[PDB]
Amino acid sequence: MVQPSLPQDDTPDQQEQRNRAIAQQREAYQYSETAGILLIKTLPQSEMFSLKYLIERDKGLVSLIANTLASNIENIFDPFDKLEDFEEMFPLLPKPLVMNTFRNDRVFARQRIAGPNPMVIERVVDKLPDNFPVTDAMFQKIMFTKKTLAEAIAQGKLFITNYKGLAELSPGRYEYQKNGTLVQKTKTIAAPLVLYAWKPEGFGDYRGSLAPIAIQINQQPDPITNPIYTPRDGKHWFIAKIFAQMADGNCHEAISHLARTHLILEPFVLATANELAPNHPLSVLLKPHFQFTLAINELAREQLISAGGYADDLLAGTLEASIAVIKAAIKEYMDNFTEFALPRELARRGVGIGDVDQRGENFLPDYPYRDDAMLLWNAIEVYVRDYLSLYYQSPVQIRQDTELQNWVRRLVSPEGGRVTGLVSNGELNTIEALVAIATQVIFVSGPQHAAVNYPQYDYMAFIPNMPLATYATPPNKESNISEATILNILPPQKLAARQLELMRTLCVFYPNRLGYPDTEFVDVRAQQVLHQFQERLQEIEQRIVLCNEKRLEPYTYLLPSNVPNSTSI
Template identity: 45%
Template sequence: MNPVLPQHDPKPDRREKYLERQRESYRYNYDYLPPIAYAEQVPISEAFSAKYQAQQFKAITKILLNLSTAELGNLFDPFNHLDDYEKLFLGEPLLPKPASTRNFLLDTEFARQRLAGANPLMIERVDHQKLQQLVQKFSVSDALFQQVVDTELSLEGAAKEGRLYLADYAMLEGMQPGRYQYWQKFITAPLALYYWQSTGYSDRGVLVPVAIQLNQKPGSNNPIFTRLDEPNWSIAKTFVQIADFNHHELISHLARTHLTIAPFVVATARQLADNHPLKILLKPHFQFTLAINDLARFSLINPGGFVDQIFAGTLKASLSLVAQSLETQEFKNLALPTELKRRGVEDTTALPNYPYRDDAYLLWNGIHRFVTEYLNLYYKNSTDVINDYELQRWAKEVTAQDGGRVKGLTEDGKVDTIEKLIEIITQLIFTCGPQHAAVNYPQYDYEAFTPNMPAASYASPPTKKDIAIGTSDQSNFLQYISPYLLKYLPPKQQAVSQLQLTYFLTAFKYDRLGYYERTDFQDPKAQALINTFQRNLHIIEDRINIRNTKRTHPYVFLKPSLIPNSISI
């Protein structure tokens, strides 16, 4: 099939008849997650293939074999020690032990996960203005800061040097907690302050946690915890991880990838003919997205499903958070360069070790180059963009109230230049591939082992400092902290469910970024660009491999060979 813009197609009637049929099959639904646009149904052409279903079956079988072989005992009995959670993983050829089982209690590992963990999207720089606002609700003193991080810098000095960072989970404030059987769940809306320490165990420094406040409003029952306050420090870190888990799964993952892309899938099917160059380019990057979203609707985010069962909030509260995130976001602000700049973390000098940012930039630039060259094959100038009436209908439908309801597609709401179109398509492909990979595939390493990142707490958060033991003797720290943490961690059945969910969502990669079926692109000029794109992806992978030899922990989630084309799992 030769790609051609509609204004140049000698058979416009054929295109229109095709699109009329498509509009019958692809419809929007606004009732499931109001007011968000959801796909009404999954057309047969969007369903999982036999190959995909075989990979699903293999993953389910592996989980069941692992759990049936593990010595679980009564699923309703409590765990007696933190080590018991690790016994759920029998190792290859069944379920491997997640990476987080090794160092999850270390402060440096806790902080590192803000930069290279499951949710590397929360940390933001605290500059002078932000610091003035922050101290109104999170009043860490200079004296405490200097004692904790062993520096002569003041908070203002650290902020001025670009070394002060914050993860603020204010969006979770007031979230209605759920229940599991007779257990009440708990979640807080914490603030966690971090400091970039330029002299650490690596030559590039290390991010260290400074202080944690578990709720947004300061008060006598909402103390500030530091490493000087064990065991409450480890408990406070656990509550941050709980908040991060819920933000990650509901906002960074579900809202900002799966549900952000879904309206574009529907609009593309309804408004772009099968021989439209954009339809040809986007189709492999939209593969199975409607199907996986539909599967989630009926097995993950349904009453009694995994979100209802193991997440901290009620199902209604969790879905309300998703809807609120989607309703308030603007598409253009989620573009990688814009999003990093908004958080103040684009400066590689101030924060030199941020694996997600550094590797994501390589992929963004590589995709941008490929998209630019591809679109220039078919759009000779911006007039071609304006005269592409299918594209204009697509853009109108994506943003319409009776369409996709996407906000902020472009700065002025128009798609009238090649440059604007390049940015939109780059962002779509980046979100479908690298961005989804960055928030999906770390789930097993960081969330399958429940003590590292629980989905909920099963005891109320500490409201007093209590007696601190300090941190001088770390030799038996695991033995010491275990009974304190156990009462907060999910019971055995919940831990098993969290393991099942995170393994199933990361068990396989259906295809590979930039590698397409032979029938996808039949234009020889486009195929030549794809060959160049693939070579560039190999170069990017080589650069990441070199970086990983210098990192204390390799970051593999944005290696191009490990990124699928689409949001398919």
């Protein structure tokens, strides 16, 4: 166990040892790709899941065998017979928290700020999209108000989710035998726009909340084939929400979860191995936050984004279409890396802590993801800054650290991740820039992945709340809607089962815990910095527990006790 040091501070003997270790690491951590996604060529045994991990994962899979044994769902591509059958899918599993209230408009809307994908909603500035022709009359009928849209917008009261990033998907296909013949079917794609309003009054008892106003299921308006639905539209409104939720779930899995936690971490894990000695302070800082990350990304390669895997079976598009969405989300992230730092990302959507009205109040006061993620972001930043200050007291030490400079060059290179938004001026020159990079990597690996991964079961294991594909077209607005209509839009039995299977496996345990690495730092000064980070997380836990006593609903996913140390499941 070596005291960490910068390579230029070491003797020539010690530097030879560092280069030896790096050369060996480069041989063990080679770069590869699947479908243009950067991944590892072969996983080192040191990077495999632990025994303890495997025991927990297996308990999960065996719990699914038991639940399936106790369930009445069948291995068929028929719809369920009754909508109530979706409630019977959990005889031996926890009931998903959304299950009993998912029909409520407020429960729908609050998933934008506290559900699995709190990453889409943005404040409307200036005007709605021209292809989303909501009228004053619609707004006024739904809000029971004489205020106009322009007035609401001028007050910062309107919010939108625009799923146009899904507009080019080729719809996925599926097929099966029924009575000795092959039936071939296609999923139905949608790319909705959803308008929300902040309602300060709430419902008399004055916890304010977001409320949904209008849904246009596809991007190009048409009064007949693509009208705007509102809550006045009865069962047609319920169906419009289903399509919007399906769209949110596709954006969730491809963009917010797979692309922008799991797969954008892969180049950082590999660059750390390919350029940093084992006793490099940055490697020692970052490796606890990479535990099991290569391995879980290899399972995603094998089981999630493979032909016949979960993405192929469950999502709206063809596998090829889903992979294209994933790769475009990676590219935009890497190209703009520092603009995806949490405060900047939120501010770009108009929903950051600085987005306030004339009285200093946030235009979106009820946003548990933002509130709790900012606590964790700020605590990690203090932890990282205090840690790196033990090793870099002056910027020349950044510039003369040949390993660190190689780590940056690897990341920005085309073959190393193409992280062209990583640094300014073509080179890492300051300590504060490195603090921001390492803060963002640790934030993504622990907190961000916890926020998008662990709500999956509560909101997406109950299939009707967020089905990963829709299986019939939106009915015409004047058509009558039966239970059969809804059951034909929702997934068939075998695919509903498959989606529960996925969601349970992704949420069943916590592989590790934020701030609690498997081995202590050798440097007692760094162990003290870590102990203070652990104290701060305890303070943050109690603050969130207090906030949750007053929130409309508790938001538990960013409690530090529930945040892993690494992206690992």
